[PDB]
Design a binder for this molecule. Structure first.
Ligand code: VAL
Length: 424
């Protein structure tokens, strides 16, 4: 008579069903990832079992697998919370948002959905929301598809195939950086928690382990660290900066993508990181120049150019080649036991602020009894290079070490964003 929990533990596998969606589960360079994947993999680790993911064709399929004997133990799928289905405690507050196309008539309230072409996923809480609206306004028309994901409905608004969709704010935020013409019209409802779904029944053995995991996850910052990483683009970049990234990805990157990729091949370095640097430096503009005679797409000094054999810094190919050689060389000089990924984040700090001021920040880390080989500690020190109190105590004095923390954070975020929609 094994409980749900004992079943898992005896099989030594946790089978989780999810959506095929950026917001939940997909693959990158290093394998499986995504918010729900990472969250569910820490749950399987907690239980001491192997995670096995299944994906459903659509939401009705996903809820049908859960009600099957022998099916998945739980669904982790950005689900908005029937004896056939039980929900965990909620783990993230998301708001349903009506999405429209920039430059078209912004709907401001529910009645404005009438006369608009509107599609949502079949079997979704979105479709239920609309079903309730239609009882009030019979003239409301909307279509449901079970052949599409949410990212695909956002693309339909983006390219103009539909006027409107309804989507959770965390999904909007994640994908706002890819669709330059989608905008939030308004919030169709207030924030509400997402929850994992479990098979119905009277056995609360796994449900209680799920809820203790989510409790822990909130306690330690795990949910918020995952949310900032995948869903945090608008909070960190601003709304305008996130959609502007979409513009520049669609209209600028294609002119340089192959340059970036050749460099990556040449230097055995992920090309999306190199493109991320270019984005943070110039917004992928070959002509950009600064005050201090640093220029071109990657922002190279004349020395760097000379050292790197770059004739013309206004040539993008050239600037990318030398910028990317220079990043990789900086990264190579760092002390050998500093490992990836920190190795790369230190290299990004150095690219921006230069080896000297970095060294001072690492020394300051050590004098504070923090670790100078630990990125997070050195990060804590860098902003101090701009505070008088602390740059007084440094060999090379004042530097814009707050800008440097922003540069590393953004490059990391841009790199993520490019990774999730491009090939290695
Ligand atoms: C899955 C998504 C579309 C939404 N949260 C829902 O539960 O239907």
């Amino acid at each position: 008579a094994p409980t749900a929990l004992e079943r898992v533990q005896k099989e030594g596998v946790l089978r989780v069903i999810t959506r095929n969606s950026p917001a939940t589960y997909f693959q990158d360079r290093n394998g499986e990832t995504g918010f729900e994947y990472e969250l569910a993999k820490r749950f399987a680790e907690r239980l001491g079992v192997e995670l096995k993911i299944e994906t459903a064709d659509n939401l009705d399929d996903l809820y049908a697998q859960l009600s099957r004997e022998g099916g998945p133990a739980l669904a982790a799928a950005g689900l908005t919370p029937d004896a056939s289905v039980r929900y965990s405690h909620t783990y993230l507050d998301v708001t349903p948002q009506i999405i429209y196309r920039n430059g078209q008539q912004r709907p401001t309230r529910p009645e404005d959905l009438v006369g608009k072409r509107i599609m949502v996923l079949k079997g979704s809480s979105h479709a239920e929301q609309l079903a309730e609206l239609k009882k009030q306004y019979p003239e409301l028309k909307y279509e449901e598809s079970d052949a599409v994901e949410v990212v695909d409905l956002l693309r339909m608004v983006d390219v103009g195939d539909i006027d409107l969709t309804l989507v959770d704010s965390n999904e909007l935020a994640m994908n706002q950086v890819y669709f330059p013409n989608v905008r939030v019209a308004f919030d169709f409802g207030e924030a509400r928690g997402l929850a994992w779904a479990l098979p119905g029944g009277d056995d609360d053995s796994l449900m209680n382990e799920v809820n203790a995991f989510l409790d822990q996850a909130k306690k330690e910052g795990l949910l918020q660290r995952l949310k900032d990483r995948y869903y945090g683009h608008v909070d960190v970049l601003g709304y305008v900066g996130a959609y502007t990234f979409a513009q520049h990805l669609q209209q600028r990157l294609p002119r340089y993508e192959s340059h970036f990729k050749q460099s990556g091949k040449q230097l055995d370095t992920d090309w999306r990181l190199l493109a991320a640097i270019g984005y943070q430096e110039s917004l992928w503009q070959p002509g950009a120049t600064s005050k201090t005679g640093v220029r071109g797409l990657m922002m190279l000094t004349n020395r760097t150019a000379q050292a790197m054999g770059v004739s013309n810094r206004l040539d993008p190919k050239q600037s990318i080649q030398g910028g990317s050689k220079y990043f990789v060389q900086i990264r190579s000089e760092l002390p050998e036991s500093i490992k990836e990924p920190d190795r790369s984040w230190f290299a990004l700090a150095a690219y921006n602020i230069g080896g000297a001021h970095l060294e001072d920040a690492r020394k300051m880390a050590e004098k504070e009894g923090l670790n100078p080989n630990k990125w997070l500690d050195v990060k804590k020190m860098l902003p101090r290079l701009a505070q008088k109190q602390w740059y007084a105590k440094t060999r090379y004095g004042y530097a814009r070490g707050g800008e440097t923390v922003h540069f590393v954070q953004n490059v990391r975020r841009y790199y993520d964003i490019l990774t999730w929609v491009t090939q290695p």
